Design a protein around this ligand. Structure first.
Ligand SMILES: [K+]
Ligand SMILES: [K+]
Ligand SMILES: [K+]
Ligand SMILES: [K+]
Ligand SMILES: [K+]
Ligand SMILES: [K+]
Ligand SMILES: [K+]
Ligand SMILES: [K+]
Ligand SMILES: [K+]
Ligand SMILES: [Mg+2]
Ligand SMILES: [Mg+2]
Ligand SMILES: [Mg+2]
Ligand SMILES: [Mg+2]
Ligand SMILES: [Mg+2]
Ligand SMILES: [Mg+2]
Ligand SMILES: [Mg+2]
Ligand SMILES: [Mg+2]
Ligand SMILES: [Mg+2]
Ligand SMILES: [Mg+2]
Ligand SMILES: [Mg+2]
Ligand SMILES: [Mg+2]
Ligand SMILES: [Mg+2]
Ligand SMILES: [Mg+2]
Ligand SMILES: [Mg+2]
Ligand SMILES: [Mg+2]
Ligand SMILES: [Mg+2]
Ligand SMILES: [Mg+2]
Ligand SMILES: [Mg+2]
Ligand SMILES: [Mg+2]
Ligand SMILES: [Mg+2]
Ligand SMILES: [Mg+2]
Ligand SMILES: [Mg+2]
Ligand SMILES: [Mg+2]
Ligand SMILES: [Mg+2]
Ligand SMILES: [Mg+2]
Ligand SMILES: [Mg+2]
Ligand SMILES: [Mg+2]
Ligand SMILES: [Mg+2]
Ligand SMILES: [Mg+2]
Ligand SMILES: [Mg+2]
Ligand SMILES: [Mg+2]
Ligand SMILES: [Mg+2]
Ligand SMILES: [Mg+2]
Ligand SMILES: [Mg+2]
Ligand SMILES: [Mg+2]
Ligand SMILES: [Mg+2]
Ligand SMILES: [Mg+2]
Ligand SMILES: [Mg+2]
Ligand SMILES: [Mg+2]
Ligand SMILES: [Mg+2]
Ligand SMILES: [Mg+2]
Ligand SMILES: [Mg+2]
Ligand SMILES: [Mg+2]
Ligand SMILES: [Mg+2]
Ligand SMILES: [Mg+2]
Ligand SMILES: [Mg+2]
Lengths: 231, 48
RNA sequence: AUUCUAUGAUUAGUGUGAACGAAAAUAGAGCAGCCUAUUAAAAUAAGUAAAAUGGCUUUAAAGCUGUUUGAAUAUUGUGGG
RNA sequence: UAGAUGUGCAUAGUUAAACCGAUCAUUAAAAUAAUGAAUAGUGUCUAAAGUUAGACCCGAAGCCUGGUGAUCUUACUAUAGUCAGGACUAUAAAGGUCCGAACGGGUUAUCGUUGCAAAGAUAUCCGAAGAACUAUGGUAAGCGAGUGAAAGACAACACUGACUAGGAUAGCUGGUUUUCUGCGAAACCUAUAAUAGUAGGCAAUUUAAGUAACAUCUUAGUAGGUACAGA
RNA sequence: UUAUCGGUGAGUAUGUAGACUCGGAAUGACAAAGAUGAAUCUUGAAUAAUCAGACAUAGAAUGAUAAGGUUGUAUGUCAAAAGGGAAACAGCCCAGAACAAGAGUUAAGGUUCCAAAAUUAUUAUUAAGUGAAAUAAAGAAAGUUUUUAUA
RNA sequence: AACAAAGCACUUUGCAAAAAGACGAUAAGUCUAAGUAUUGAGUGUGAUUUC
RNA sequence: UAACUGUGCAGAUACAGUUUACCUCUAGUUAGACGAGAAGACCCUAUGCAGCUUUACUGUUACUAAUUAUUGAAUACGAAUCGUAUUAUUAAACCUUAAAUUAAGGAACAAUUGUUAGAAGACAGUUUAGGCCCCAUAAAGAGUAAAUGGGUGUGUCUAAAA
RNA sequence: AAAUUAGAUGUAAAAAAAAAAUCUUAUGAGGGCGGAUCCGCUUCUAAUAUUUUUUUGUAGUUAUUAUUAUAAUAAUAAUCAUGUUUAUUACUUAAAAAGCUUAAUGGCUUAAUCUUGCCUUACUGUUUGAUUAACAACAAAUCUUACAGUCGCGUAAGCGGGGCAUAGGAUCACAAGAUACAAAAAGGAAAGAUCUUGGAUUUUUGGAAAAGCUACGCUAGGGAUAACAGGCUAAUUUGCGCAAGAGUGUACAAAAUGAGUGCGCGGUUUGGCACCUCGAUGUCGGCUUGACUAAUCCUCAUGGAUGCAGAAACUAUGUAGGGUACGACUGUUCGUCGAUUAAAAAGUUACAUGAGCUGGGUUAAAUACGUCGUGAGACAGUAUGGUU
């Protein structure tokens, strides 16, 4: 004696259903999900919208599948023609908007600061063109260093800031969520981002290769001056 | 005996942990998980 | 101060459970204070308080106890809770 | 005269809990972002009830504690008594010797079976100087077991552990007393050291608030593969 | 070299079916609207009994296609339901008893007598008391009737 | 036909303060025993004959 | 307070049908009244009991060993303090004989107390009552029983990279 | 026989236009009419589908042939190709099978399979609607939604709260982190409280630390049939019949005989069931006394029998009036034998009959032996004894 699984149809055709209601429990897709329907992990079909269950076949979608849908109007018939405009319901209620306004207080009912902030302290014409190329690169290299120095000042101030906030029991401590946002704003995990750029690496690889080859030129030329004196 | 239950301790020193199973004849576990105390994804490492 | 009755209380608490189960306080019955005790007693208490261990009681405290050990001397803050 | 006194419940909700409070709780900071919870009590009588007490009534075998009994019977103990006659044997008297009365047993059969008898009658049979039998006292018995030529034998109606007094339970069985009126089941599922029980459902009853209630049919629609038929 | 053995290919060939179903009912199930109906339903408050069921009919499992056997399903009765019929009868066929009256009207079932009501009409068979309210079989044979052929 | 039994066998008991054994909510102590290894207790066997 | 056949909680004096029989006693007899009595006899049940057994569960003891205390000396040795070994002791621990002593012997053992460990059914109490998954049975929704039929079923595997 | 590799369907790719009809749809004409969008009626246009419908066109290019004056015309064949022919792109290619953690079932081929890149959402809190109100209760479970937080992948849309689906148990105690709730005079603490998590043949898996005997058994009950008989059934039988006829009978089926079978009756043996508690485990024996049945051992009548000459005997049809004795050995009936006899046949009746007898039996406690068990004990054992 096992516990019965009770598989099969839980809603017959034209039966009213609201979102989440199970329509068909199955082992595998005996009936595929169709219009306004969801399939769960175990292939159970649920209504996604309020409406009436409809069992149909869509030869345009799949030649040999049978689907279950949900129509907002009991008199509608599926499958809807592919060229007809989608039938959808708003599903929203109108309410007056909020009158929220920035009214952050400074002191609690006991006269104590809500937050106390502490900061820390610690080749004729080509040469002309190449010069324009070098200047542009040198200009950006100066700008990059003129702005990377700026980022190192905002990070230092942020990571060094300490906003102590009033908590229960008249205690003053830093909240854990603010401690998390010290390293950086949410949205990405600091450290996973690649600090370097692939294009910059290629540029460095060439420069190192040039000095190496050019290094042999100077050493080879230097050796020639020593040989001239010998001869 | 073949499988052990390890504890992945947060590296934010917040005291939150995740428990996953792994075979003994394998390497220690190490994952990037969400620490609900600081509400940020940090590095979790096996306890021992 | 003690004793008797009810409430406090199928409570605090204990116990795997089943069950077991206070005290403060309140009300009533009685009421009484003393050591020169209204019938003749203390020169204010040392193998004692307490500790370890084996049990009892119990909530782990307090209380009772066999074995082995073992203190201090008054609010000018000594000793018990 | 005046003032105080004597349990309790309700008046505010919320959370594990406090803070907090028409707001509170989870959201590791908070914030209508989400979710839950908000408004007549109290006393009395009549009746039906849950709980704890004997608990609707009657009924065990047993277990523990305190007492009683060895005038029955078993063994031992002290003091006493009894055993016609004959035969054999080494003795006058030396033998668990022989036949057989008293006495002590109880072998076989019959009767009896609300008997004369809660162990008898008749006949038959066994021992009958010995490990014999009998009398009057004494000692030893009931958590442990007294006594036992040993049979779970006997210890005064009872003994695989007596009698008496005190303290029980029984999911098991039986019984539960006047009339009239209205409604009216189930013998199924789940759990259970459970199946003779019980609990939660389904669900019978009472009487209030609701009903786009429930039942049946018609019309259109939907799920699902049996009978049949087929290879 | 075989209308021998096995195997393979073809067949719109024949059969077989709890785990074959291309085809495919009725029944039953779900829900919508309308109508009808004897409140039969839901909720609130209060609060039960019951937890070996039995037989009948259909269709199965099991047994041996045995059991007044055992075990599911569908429907009913009994259980807790008297009355009429089944000779007597828990379970079958009818029908649900508040009390009387009536050659009243009917169900199931019956109508010669016991015993209320037909010895009522029509057409055939049976001659064995077969039979007449619980079918013993295969089979045999100048029993007899009818039909179809036939001399 | 069972128990006992005489006979036989084995184990244990040295008695110097308690011989062993039995008994004593548990001891002093009692039986053993006014006994002493040929004594006492326990165990099995069951005269003798053959073993 | 009849016989037969039938029926029926399944063996009829009492029901159905038929049959038979004047009323009422006496003495005999025991076929039936599932005759009376004995809860006498058998099986099953109870999370009822009793006794017994054991390599059942949990315990207490017989018994063995160690140890603080009663309990001190002398010497030797090992680590003034501890521990070990031996010797002696009216030279008043304690023990035995002995009204019970400057007597005799034993002797720091024994014995007793507390604690600890081991240990006999010798004794006591109590117990002894298999989940999950798939298919068919299953009767065209779901459900559906049987020490029913099938399954070499399952009591898991898996961090993803070298 | 069994090793690797290569294979194993077909089609299409210049291009159509146009007429009406049948529905169906439309957030089209804000159509019209009733009650811009709702609802019931509705004409028109548009789109999809369908017709076999109504047709028209089916070229151009390369080449061939024919006529015409290298060109023109007609027919025929080829024609996806401005593209590294290994072409490419789209559709098509039964079922089963392989693969998807593991059996089976279903599903997936348009991905749930496979390969590759980057990842670790196998996330935290709360929460929605369902499983015709999960398991016909509760709980542990299964699927699903939303909001906040912040991460991955992706051009984007978006997807992600592990796995294609269906096979891994709580509390208590204990342990490791967080929470900052309470802290028994007070300040701390201990021991508690909330959240997360771990170790379980908690495998009797809604969750006890657990062996037997009693024939000396006790009490309370049920008689779920247990020792009997009755009741239902008839597998089996040491109970029978009928039908058919392989075969035997020197010949010749049916004088006799009758394989393996079929259709049956009947309730004696061994069974099944369990309505039912009662005189039992050899369920039965002997004695006394019967009553009934007929499937006949004796006695009486009789058919068949190349296999009835006579006699005897065989087979069958009528017939149950009266008989079917006596003893030995076997616990018993089972049986076996002895000698007579016309013959020494069977069955039913609660073993027919123990409020008629017996105790051969139906049950004990004693004792010995045998077998089994560590033991208490057990045995359909054996022997003696045992209030009817
Ligand atoms: K409490
Ligand atoms: K204390
Ligand atoms: K004599
Ligand atoms: K007795
Ligand atoms: K009624
Ligand atoms: K009689
Ligand atoms: K008589
Ligand atoms: K014993
Ligand atoms: K069905
Ligand atoms: Mg009080
Ligand atoms: Mg004082
Ligand atoms: Mg003290
Ligand atoms: Mg203290
Ligand atoms: Mg004190
Ligand atoms: Mg409050
Ligand atoms: Mg006497
Ligand atoms: Mg003599
Ligand atoms: Mg003699
Ligand atoms: Mg005697
Ligand atoms: Mg008599
Ligand atoms: Mg019913
Ligand atoms: Mg019960
Ligand atoms: Mg089909
Ligand atoms: Mg039945
Ligand atoms: Mg009843
Ligand atoms: Mg009736
Ligand atoms: Mg009639
Ligand atoms: Mg009339
Ligand atoms: Mg008449
Ligand atoms: Mg007749
Ligand atoms: Mg001898
Ligand atoms: Mg002694
Ligand atoms: Mg002997
Ligand atoms: Mg002998
Ligand atoms: Mg009868
Ligand atoms: Mg009558
Ligand atoms: Mg017991
Ligand atoms: Mg000396
Ligand atoms: Mg015991
Ligand atoms: Mg079904
Ligand atoms: Mg439910
Ligand atoms: Mg404190
Ligand atoms: Mg304190
Ligand atoms: Mg269970
Ligand atoms: Mg369950
Ligand atoms: Mg029954
Ligand atoms: Mg022949
Ligand atoms: Mg004859
Ligand atoms: Mg003749
Ligand atoms: Mg003749
Ligand atoms: Mg005559
Ligand atoms: Mg007889
Ligand atoms: Mg009789
Ligand atoms: Mg015996
Ligand atoms: Mg023996
Ligand atoms: Mg005798």
């Amino acid at each position: 004696r096992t516990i019965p699984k009770k598989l099969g149809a839980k809603k017959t055709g034209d039966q009213y259903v609201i979102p989440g209601n199970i329509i068909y429990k199955q082992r595998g897709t005996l009936w595929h999900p169709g219009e306004n329907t969801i399939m769960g992990r175990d292939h159970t079909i649920h209504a996604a919208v309020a409406g009436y269950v409809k069992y149909y076949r869509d030869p345009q979608l799949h030649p040999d599948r049978q689907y279950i849908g949900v129509v907002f109007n009991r008199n509608d018939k599926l499958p809807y023609p592919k060229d007809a405009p989608r039938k959808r319901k708003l599903g929203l209620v109108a309410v007056p908007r909020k009158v929220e306004e920035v009214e952050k207080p400074t002191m609690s009912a006991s006269g104590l600061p809500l937050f106390v902030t502490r900061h820390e302290t610690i080749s004729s014409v080509i040469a002309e063109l190449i010069k324009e190329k070098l200047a542009a690169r040198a200009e950006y290299n100066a700008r990059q260093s003129a702005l990377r120095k700026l980022q190192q000042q905002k990070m230092l101030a942020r990571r060094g800031t300490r906003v102590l906030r009033l908590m229960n029991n008249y205690s003053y401590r830093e909240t854990n969520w603010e401690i998390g946002r010290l390293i950086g704003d949410p949205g990405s995990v600091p450290g996973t981002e690649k600090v370097g750029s692939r294009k910059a690496k290629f540029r460095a690889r060439r420069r190192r290769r040039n000095t190496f080859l050019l290094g042999i030129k100077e050493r080879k030329l230097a050796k020639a001056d020593r040989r001239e004196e010998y001869r | 005996s073949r499988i052990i239950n390890v504890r992945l301790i947060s590296m934010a020193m917040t005291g939150y942990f995740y428990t996953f199973t792994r075979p003994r004849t394998s390497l220690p576990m190490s994952m990037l998980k969400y620490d609900p105390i600081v509400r940020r994804k940090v590095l979790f490492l096996e306890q021992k």
